[PDB]
């Protein structure tokens, strides 16, 4: 068996066992960091499938569950909020944080998100790029969700330069363990006393919501609200990160698209679609035990075994995506959802959010600044390493 995670086959690349074994061996054991074993699902179905099976648990207390890391066992033994429970739980505090992210109040955060991009957008123009190239990474990557995410929790704006860069610092590849561990519980300090604050006055943000709505009538603790607010925080701010910088790189790796997005900003939602399909920067969330053996294409997977079901994957599965190693704009979608957002219940709470902020990043960036340029060859892009999920750590750009 294997050793999973599978590496990237190269910078902006899915690692390449999975096309082989969507041919040849689709439902198949992998073996994880402790030795022990999993089931590695790569075909479009089949995730849907284990996405949406009742017979399937992300309680992670299950043996069998698939921990990929060694920290990633230590943190399974805190309480879990609701991305690692399964129903009635799941939905009972789901629900709590659920309305700032309906189709509709993203619609009606549209104008906001607007704003906060063009803000940036002008931010950069002015600082400029006279003496050199700048990082678009740290200059727009990182603050755009940054921002967005911090202000609908609740963080005041002088405060959102210092924490975006401590959130950075959790998840940067250079970042020591110390630094990180030290950033992350500065984090979890910083939001237990606006949760303390929004108790005593309530303001129009998520955290005011869970005080009033959860802490006061008893339904959740204080350090519930810390715990779910920073849920929300760090469960997908990396992977906007890296998803705007992936859509400037692949844009500049096909130039005609590139020509035809500026020509057409409208075009920029179905970019969008596209880019998440094709670069899956959240791959290794969908994960299970079963509770009960299961059939699974022609494998059994028995009561307390663990199963990863690879979304990447089966983003390229081609009996589902025509070409799928191509990046098509354009492309002609069937009725199947891609899956860079997960599926069923657990499928990304921010997915509509999210989509909101590259779509509004994709239809302004090359209006604001129509000669962007990666001031680097494509070929020496500093991408994530590669036996983690896809990104990109900087990105030298010029305008
Ligand atoms: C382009 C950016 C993003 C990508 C690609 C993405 C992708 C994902 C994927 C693959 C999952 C797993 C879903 C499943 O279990 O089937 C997920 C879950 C989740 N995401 Fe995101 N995400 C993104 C942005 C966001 C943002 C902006 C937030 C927060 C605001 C967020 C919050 C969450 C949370 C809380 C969950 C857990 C949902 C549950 O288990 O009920 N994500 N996301």
Redesign the pocket.
Known sequence: APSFPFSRASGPEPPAEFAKLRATNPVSQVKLFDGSLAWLVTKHKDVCFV?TSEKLS?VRTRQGFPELSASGKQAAKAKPT???MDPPE?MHQ?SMVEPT?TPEAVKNLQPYIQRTVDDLLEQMKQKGCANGPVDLVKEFALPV?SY??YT?LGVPFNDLEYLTQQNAIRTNGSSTAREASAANQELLDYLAILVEQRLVEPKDDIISKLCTEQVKPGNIDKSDAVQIAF???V???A??VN?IALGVATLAQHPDQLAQLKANPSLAPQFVEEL?RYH????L??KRTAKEDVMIGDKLVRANEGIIAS?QSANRDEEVFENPDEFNMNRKWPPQDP?????????????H???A??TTVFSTLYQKFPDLKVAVPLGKINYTPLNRDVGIVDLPVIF
């Open positions: 996405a992300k609701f991305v690692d799941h789901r992210f969700p967005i995410i609908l849920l929300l925080l469960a997908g701010n992977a906007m998803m998440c899956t920067a959240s791959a969330a969908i979304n899956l860079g957002f997960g599926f069923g219940d657990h499928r990304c709470i921010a997915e959010l999210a989509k902020e590259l």
